[PDB]
Amino acid sequence: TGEPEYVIPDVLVRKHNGHWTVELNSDSIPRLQINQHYASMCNNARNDGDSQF
Amino acid sequence: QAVEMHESTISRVTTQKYLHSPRGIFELKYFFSSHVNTEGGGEASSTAIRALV
Amino acid sequence: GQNMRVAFMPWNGYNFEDSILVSERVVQEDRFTTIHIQELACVSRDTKL
DNA sequence: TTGTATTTATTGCAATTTTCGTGCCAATTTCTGG
DNA sequence: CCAGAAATTGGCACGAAAATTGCAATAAATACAA
C-alpha cells in the first residue's frame, strides 16, 4: 500500500530544431496584480489619511 | 562571470530549484561538482568518475 | 447475421414468453461465435526518488 | 530665471563555515615454503 | 595441508578551495510653483 511522490519542476528544458530551449514552468510561476477598484479612489477630494494610506 | 553577478546571487538563486529535462528531474545545484586532473591538461568531474566506477 | 432453419411450435415450455430453443449443431459449427479484443496499459513515470 | 517632493533604479561584499582531494597507519584478507 | 608471511580499507588528519550568510533602506533623474 503506497503511492510515489512527485516534484513539480521550476525550469523546463527541451530540444527544438536541434537547439536547447529553456523556459519557466508556466503552471508554477508566481504572479500578482493591482486591485484597480481600491486604487481608483486615489483622488485628493477624499480624506488625506485615506490618500496617504 | 558568465552572467556578470556575484557568487552569492548565484548561490541563492540555485537553492531548492528543480529542472525538468527529457532525461529526468534534477536540481540546479546538481550540475556543480569538483574535478580531478587528467593527463594532458584535461579535467574530469567527480560525477563522471563516479559514473565510470 | 446467419440463416437458420426454424419451426414455429411450442416445445415443452422451453420457448415460453419469448424464450428461444437452440440446437447443439448450431453451437458445434461456431455459427454465432464472436471475437472480442481488450486493451491494457502500463505507464512508467518519473518521480523525485 | 531655480529650489523642492516624487518616481524609479539599486541583485554586491566579507567573514565564515563546509567541503574537496589525498597521505599515514592499524585492523582485516591473500601469497608461499616444510 | 597448514602455518608464517604479504595486500586491503576506512578512520583521521592536513591544507586549500568553495558555498553560505549577515549586512534591510539608499541615490539619481524628473516635474512644478515664485
UniProtKB/Swiss-Prot annotation, chain A:
<comment type="function">
    <text>Sigma factors are initiation factors that promote the attachment of RNA polymerase to specific initiation sites and are then released. This sigma factor is responsible for the expression of enzymes involved in arginine catabolism. The open complex (sigma-54 and core RNA polymerase) serves as the receptor for the receipt of the melting signal from the remotely bound activator protein GlnG(NtrC).</text>
</comment>
<protein>
    <recommendedName>
        <fullName>RNA polymerase sigma-54 factor</fullName>
    </recommendedName>
</protein>
<comment type="similarity">
    <text>Belongs to the sigma-54 factor family.</text>
</comment>
From Swiss-Prot, chain C:
<comment type="subunit">
    <text>The RNAP catalytic core consists of 2 alpha, 1 beta, 1 beta' and 1 omega subunit. When a sigma factor is associated with the core the holoenzyme is formed, which can initiate transcription. The rRNA transcription and antitermination complex (rrnTAC) consists of RNAP, NusA, NusB, NusE (rpsJ), NusG, SubB, ribosomal protein S4, DNA and precursor rRNA; S4 is more flexible than other subunits. In pull-down experiments interacts with CedA.</text>
</comment>
<comment type="subunit">
    <text>(Microbial infection) Interacts (via flap domain) with Escherichia phage lambda antitermination protein Q; this interaction renders bacterial RNAP resistant to transcription pausing and allows it to read through termination signals.</text>
</comment>
<comment type="function">
    <text>DNA-dependent RNA polymerase (RNAP) catalyzes the transcription of DNA into RNA using the four ribonucleoside triphosphates as substrates.</text>
</comment>
<comment type="similarity">
    <text>Belongs to the RNA polymerase beta chain family.</text>
</comment>
<comment type="function">
    <text>Resistance to the antibiotics salinamide A, salinamide B, rifampicin, streptolydigin, CBR703, myxopyronin, and lipiarmycin can result from mutations in this protein.</text>
</comment>
<protein>
    <recommendedName>
        <fullName>DNA-directed RNA polymerase subunit beta</fullName>
    </recommendedName>
</protein>
